[PDB]
From a paper:
Structures with donor substrates were determined by soaking the apo form crystals with ADP-glucose and GDP-glucose. The donor substrates interact primarily with the C-terminal domain through the side chains of the highly conserved Arg286, Lys291, Asp385, and Glu393 and with the side chain of Arg365, which is conserved in all mycobacteria and closely related species but less conserved outside this group. Backbone interactions with the absolutely conserved residue Gly386, Met387, Asn388, and Leu389 amine groups are also observed. N-terminal domain interactions with the donor substrate are observed only for His168 when the active site is in an open conformation. Preference for ADP-glucose as the donor substrate in MtrOtsA is conferred by interactions with the deeply buried adenine moiety. The carbonyl groups of Leu319 and Arg361 interact with the primary amine, and the amide group of Val363 interacts with N-1 of the adenine moiety. A highly coordinated water interacts with the primary amine of the adenine moiety and the carbonyl groups of Leu359 and Arg361. The presence of the leucine in M. thermoresistibile allows the primary amine of the adenine moiety to occupy a buried position, interacting with the carbonyl group of Leu319 which no other nucleotide activated donor can occupy. The binding affinity of substrate donors could be determined only for ADP-glucose under the tested conditions with an observable Kd (dissociation constant) of 27.17 ± 2.66 μM.
Numbering used by the authors:
A (entry chain A), B (entry chain A), C (entry chain A), D (entry chain A): 7 to 23, 32 to 477
Amino acid sequence: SGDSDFVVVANRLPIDLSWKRSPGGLVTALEPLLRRRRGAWIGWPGIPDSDEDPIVDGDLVLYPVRLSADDVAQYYEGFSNATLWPLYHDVIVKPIYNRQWWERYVEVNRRFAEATSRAAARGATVWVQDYQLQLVPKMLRELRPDLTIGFFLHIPFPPVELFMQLPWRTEITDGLLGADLVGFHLPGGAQNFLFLARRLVGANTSRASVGVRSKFGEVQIGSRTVKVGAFPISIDSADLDRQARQRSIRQRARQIRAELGNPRRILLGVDRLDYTKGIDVRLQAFAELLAEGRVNREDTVFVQLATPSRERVEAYRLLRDDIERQVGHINGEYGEVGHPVVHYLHRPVPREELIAFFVAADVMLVTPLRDGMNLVAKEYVACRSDLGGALVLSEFTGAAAELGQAYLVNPHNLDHVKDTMVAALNQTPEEGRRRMRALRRQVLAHDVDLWARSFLDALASTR
Amino acid sequence: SGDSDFVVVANRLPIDLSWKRSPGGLVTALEPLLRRRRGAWIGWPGIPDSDEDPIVDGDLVLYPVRLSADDVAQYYEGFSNATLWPLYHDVIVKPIYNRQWWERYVEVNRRFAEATSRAAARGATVWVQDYQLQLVPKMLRELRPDLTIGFFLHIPFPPVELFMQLPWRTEITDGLLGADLVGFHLPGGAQNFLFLARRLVGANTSRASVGVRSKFGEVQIGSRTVKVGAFPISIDSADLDRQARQRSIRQRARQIRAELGNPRRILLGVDRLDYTKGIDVRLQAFAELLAEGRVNREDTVFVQLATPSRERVEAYRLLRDDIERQVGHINGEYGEVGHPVVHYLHRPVPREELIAFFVAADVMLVTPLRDGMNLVAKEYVACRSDLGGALVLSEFTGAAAELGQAYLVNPHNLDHVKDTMVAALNQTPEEGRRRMRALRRQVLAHDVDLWARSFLDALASTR
Amino acid sequence: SGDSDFVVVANRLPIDLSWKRSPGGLVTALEPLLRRRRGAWIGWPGIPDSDEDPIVDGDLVLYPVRLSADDVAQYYEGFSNATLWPLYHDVIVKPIYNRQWWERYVEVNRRFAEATSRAAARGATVWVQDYQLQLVPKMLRELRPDLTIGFFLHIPFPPVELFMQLPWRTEITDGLLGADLVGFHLPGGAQNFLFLARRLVGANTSRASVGVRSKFGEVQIGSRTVKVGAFPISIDSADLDRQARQRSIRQRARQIRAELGNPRRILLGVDRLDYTKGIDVRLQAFAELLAEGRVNREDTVFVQLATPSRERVEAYRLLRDDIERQVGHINGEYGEVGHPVVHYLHRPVPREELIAFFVAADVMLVTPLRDGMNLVAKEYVACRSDLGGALVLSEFTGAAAELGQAYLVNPHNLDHVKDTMVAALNQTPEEGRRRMRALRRQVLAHDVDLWARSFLDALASTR
Amino acid sequence: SGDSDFVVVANRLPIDLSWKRSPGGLVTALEPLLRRRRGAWIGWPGIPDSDEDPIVDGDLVLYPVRLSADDVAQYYEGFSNATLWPLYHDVIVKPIYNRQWWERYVEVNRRFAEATSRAAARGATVWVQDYQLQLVPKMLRELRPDLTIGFFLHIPFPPVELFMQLPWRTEITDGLLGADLVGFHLPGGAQNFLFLARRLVGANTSRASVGVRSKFGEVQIGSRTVKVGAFPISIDSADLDRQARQRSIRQRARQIRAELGNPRRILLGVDRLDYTKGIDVRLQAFAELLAEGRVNREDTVFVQLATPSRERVEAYRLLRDDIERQVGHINGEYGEVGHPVVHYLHRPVPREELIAFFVAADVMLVTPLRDGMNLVAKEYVACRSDLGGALVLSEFTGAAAELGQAYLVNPHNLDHVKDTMVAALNQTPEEGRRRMRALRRQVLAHDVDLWARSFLDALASTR
Ligand SMILES: Nc1ncnc2c1ncn2[C@@H]1O[C@H](COP(=O)(O)OP(=O)(O)O[C@H]2O[C@H](CO)[C@@H](O)[C@H](O)[C@H]2O)[C@@H](O)[C@H]1O
Ligand SMILES: Nc1ncnc2c1ncn2[C@@H]1O[C@H](COP(=O)(O)OP(=O)(O)O[C@H]2O[C@H](CO)[C@@H](O)[C@H](O)[C@H]2O)[C@@H](O)[C@H]1O
Ligand SMILES: Nc1ncnc2c1ncn2[C@@H]1O[C@H](COP(=O)(O)OP(=O)(O)O[C@H]2O[C@H](CO)[C@@H](O)[C@H](O)[C@H]2O)[C@@H](O)[C@H]1O
Ligand SMILES: Nc1ncnc2c1ncn2[C@@H]1O[C@H](COP(=O)(O)OP(=O)(O)O[C@H]2O[C@H](CO)[C@@H](O)[C@H](O)[C@H]2O)[C@@H](O)[C@H]1O
């Protein structure tokens, strides 16, 4: 019946493609828990039409979920990325409502639930991850009412006015309510969920504000209670802090500045390419600052590192076209031959190279239109043990709830985005250090370990 | 100092362009109150660069507000229609954030406040109308703290996640909080407003659900309390009921059906042209039903009457192009020469002609994506004293909160929109009558008089 | 070796899909020649992956060419319709240059040549039809130097400045030069071909103007001479004339006018849907005339009958969208419920119904941007034995070279298109008759029989 | 009556904006003729609403033509740049036919003719320049039949099938026929003009091919004959040759290569931004070569220098957007931070800097879709006295008729454009020198002086 007493369910297995374990991430965050539990991980291995035979990793048992390329297209590229993703992110792009996508999403979700049941021992603890798998908790509780089930959403949970658009709004809500604990990064998501529970499902809920890792909400579902909480994700702050101190990284950061023609100021953007990330906004702000002579085109350069994402989704292709136009435009207007003012890469950057960029950057531009947390904001902070740099951060990130000492911006307020970029570029050394010290105190004290433990303690208490 | 003890403030004066009073509307709803008060109306006369000399109407004193064509472009076509309107309607279209529009909106709002102060006697009651004038209550209270000020929003008040986009979010919120009473059509708007008050402004508010014309919310603003309520607007039900019974109207309805080639079923759409109104959705549903042979192209016709709106706003021009494409397409595919399946007019229809269409229509299609109330739903119901017809109504209207006996649809769920249109077309006489009787009981009992009195009683109680 | 002494090669067999002979067309025009020759027809049967076994029709032997759906996509929808077609029609739409399309076009052309060789007896006469098969004459002469080969292009032959764009310009030119006779509708095409022969291929040609069915051009290709001529295609004028006189047709024409609400004037457009046909132009002209009050929206109606074409080619889908927008727009602006000013059908009209429309129409609108001949202009004329009606005809048709008594227009000169439509609508009975009599004298004397005989006499003389 | 016996008429005066004479160009080419004649120049000074008082330059008398910003918009940006320009260049972009533009073009042309008459002495020689002023010769001959009038078109003269689109085709043709000599860069243009003369105007013309600076064509216009010829424009080859040899230029070329990260190969594009210039084609070719690994992204760089043009014309803005997208795209895909594979400037480059780029570039990419001559091809050749470099040149330039030793390409044949770019990048030193020597022999022997003298000798012989 499966001999795992702790099970993680996520769209992907924690491996890279023969194959090896992916570095960092949740799987590393859960390392010391797997040392005391019989742990399993359920997910798609990332290859189409694979076996579903369990793979032993010593520390982990991997249960591959079989998906065809067609399953992936309709469940993932379709329903997950082109229905749920834009809807949950404040419909920045118009969601597509497609019944064939929904039906595949249901099937695939069931397949994940079945795989989980195979792995899970009696009374096992299950942690379901993220928006692609919102039906699993209910499906799992129906197959296996003995299980303790947690669910955490890594993206925002939208306001009810928007969520209601979903023709399958009730099925998704019922899906989440199959969990013992439903967690979000922010109290706002939790409160939206409680309100949805009363409005759409008619369940009795708690009415108080939801705290951070405390003051939990409750939804009554017949005989049982669903716990609702906010657990803001973070990074392995100490590890990144240590990694950024390496001599090789610091020398690379110096070499990067030399390769850029030794600018006095470097702005940096690091993003998975997504319309949620507000890359177009920072480029527009930068172009207008150059037009206004408020940024010196001779000693200031912007580096944007976009890692490719969701190429088969038309909205992402269109966003890529817009950004790339902006890059060519800005350089043609304000650059010189042999000296761009914008450097842009559309590719995955090796982790040590990326860290060197964090170390090199005088201003980190993290300006999403809407983002669940955004780890890049926290990664930059963790890397600046030298206390240099400046973080310009959108209010519409979960990170802005913790990183209040950054230069916060409303990305829709372009005038203030521009004022703020100038302010960050021209800050005094002391003021820069004051902010970075405060940000680091936060990020170092609130790491992924605290997050993981807080969620699992909450989940454990529902027993 | 002005000798009016009751003052209405709205973007437009209640006149038609020399000039005469506009029929119906709020000005008719307030007729018996003006018989017992010295009443004034403040608004733009609809002509550019006019005098601001008061005009006596016997029952009313009209205070024209001077606006230039440029004022109208930036305050109205700009900020009101291309910033606030799309934002408040769940960003169906992308709002434009423009500082020049904001500054004009502020100036014009101040000009309205000044005009109000001129007209208003000491201790006068003021009722400010709608989204173009959200700054007036605060501006007015600053000029004239002796006044009792009510404000009613005729469009939805969006969720906080969306409202927060507005770079001038705080100024707008402070603006509304200048009122003694802030009213919305729905509890949902009221509750969004209270939540915004706590989150953005930090004011202490009530935490309970907001009732309908009862169980009011409260926002504490220093020394004074702001009342927050839901007052769902309606029509002069009895008057429209009476008007629809005229012999001439009923004969016209018969003649309309003959001019349409005597179809067995007529579907009707009546809308101010707006992307909020979901005209594209009903056309898509109709086209697919015809493709699927689920509607008989030989005996069923759809009439769409769009009255022109906001021609200088690009989004409205684009929507008009899309709808008109759909019309040509559907007729080219399923019509015959001499017999369209879709009749479409882009023009204002005389009121008696419009009522004849309500009487003629077997199915009323009211399918907005998002609408504050939508009066057309209620007008149709009021017209069907014969108890014929069927109302297909979007859940995303304020009207759907009262007209639950209609055929309710999620307009994003196209499959169900299509199922519902077939069901309404093919309903039994008895089932049709059962629904229409129940709808009429509601609409006849809850008219614009009840709405107006409920709001003003609430406003009066803040003294 | 095949026992046919006269062979027609065309993209399609002359059949309809079991199957029966297509009415009218070239196959009917060649009926009395097949009575004195052993005739064969080579072409695709219109079904994918068919046999290539000959089919005896008594009067004809049909040699089916096997094509896969992929062959059709790349050779026909691709190279023929999306490379050659827009290029030859003055690049109204941007040609797509695709090497995979070219290679398939070559393969398919070879397959046609092989099929021809199978059917053709020693010394047989072969008539290759149109732009999809321009490589066949050279390929055929290489396989079978005993054959007499004619080729006729049914579309315009573009000026050299445009033809030169084609990366495979030389291969196409060499292809055509494989024929003993290369014929075009117009001297202009013939002269373009001669000039191309000198410029691109370097062959010695004649330098005189090319006559109509006379004064032929010559291209010297080593040992042999290629004849170049103009043979303007026509219709079976006498048959259509006779058909239009039927009592049933005339009664249908009257019934059509009654079904249109008995307009005083009917304008008609009849076209295979194509961006070459200038349907968008006549709609624009009509809309502006209505806007200007120069056409009476109360007693004048426009009927447009578009038969579907090339749905898998994006440019045709886009044109359909534009036209259909125009239709919806014009009706929404100038129509009434129950009375459109534009009736539009996107569907094949039965031949007797179409003829009834020709008979009913007061003004025939034939306004292509560029058209090889356009048979509709001549069909209308043939149908008006009552001498009623008016033909408005684009100068950029081959038909305008013969139908000079029509109301000729430059479709790019919209002001004059509009003036001309008013003039045609309001012509005196006598002036209308004078033009229609002259047009009919032309069309009745120059029919498809004269065309076919003239081409084949020219082809025969090369022996 | 004006005391100038030689008069140049062009859209612009030969000055830069107080003001000074523009370097190089036609005005320098005509320097030794002005030393023996009383010369005048008629044109717009480039400022709106100026005086028309003559300005003495000692060597020249400048007659400013008064134009308002509105005149410029409708005559120049409108008719010239958005009607004639796309039409004459094979409708790469769709011409706009606008009667208001035409009427302004007529008025402005008349104003130029009047200014000319003011300056011109009895029996004076007049040289009218280019496509904005095609009506002047007829207008001038009507005012002043004593004048000898030449006209030269600097852009291609399109084939008749395209020219015929122009609603004002006859007025333009009559306009040109007002000249004693009409000259084009190429025999092809001359021959198109003769054919147009016979077809549209019905004039008797010569029928032979038109030679280069010889074997002239003739159009008979009543009593007088119009000479038609081909005079391919060139540059001051010797001066540019000398200029490129300067030590400072050669050092700058070396410094440019160092600033580019010392690539082994530099490709260069230099163009006035125009959709005729095929900048999008070379970028596409370069991107695909990089994708295919046929160009080394580590040691090969492309520099594109676009100088801004016609910003108020939407087609030019759209082309700029497309190019700039391509630049950003290619760099994001194949560049490195600190090392773009494409450098792009949208700005006027100082002449000495531009020459340094010619000297630095290993491959010159001159790939227009259609261009009258293209001087950049010849400028590059003149600069390479070191015999290094390679010229990749579109067949669809007038320059390709003289520069046959370059690497000629059909820009529509992208496969061959790509093959050719690889071939040019990888040519042997010797083969490179062989081509460059031959090209230089041509360009050095056929300079702007030969062109100017040949045209004026032809013009003089019509006396
Ligand atoms: N060019 C590049 N090269 C190499 N690495 C790059 C890169 N660009 C970004 N990365 C890395 O990818 C990760 C992106 O982190 P995000 O917070 O943006 O996660 P994401 O949006 O994908 O997932 C969701 O989950 C996370 C965690 O819950 C939330 O922060 C987020 O809001 C939510 O959308 C970072 O670790 C970052 O360093
Ligand atoms: N073709 C036509 N010819 C003639 N008359 C036509 C017409 N089409 C529509 N009308 C009339 O115009 C009015 C439209 O009523 P709506 O409820 O849609 O108001 P509207 O959206 O403009 O204003 C806002 O205020 C009202 C009242 O608060 C809210 O119902 C609404 O949600 C909100 O957007 C109806 O009275 C209707 O009969
Ligand atoms: N809605 C409808 N319903 C039923 N029938 C319809 C119809 N619309 C058009 N037709 C019929 O289809 C034919 C179209 O004739 P065209 O001259 O336009 O041919 P087409 O352009 O396809 O072919 C090419 O070959 C012919 C003949 O050489 C050239 O005239 C032409 O220029 C060239 O492009 C007519 O017989 C017409 O009556
Ligand atoms: N980025 C940059 N910075 C500085 N200078 C730059 C530049 N880009 C281009 N130039 C210069 O501008 C000129 C462009 O020459 P073209 O031949 O392309 O002329 P153009 O097309 O404008 O005019 C028309 O006239 C000429 C002459 O008859 C014809 O060659 C042409 O076909 C026709 O369209 C060159 O002298 C070139 O060196």
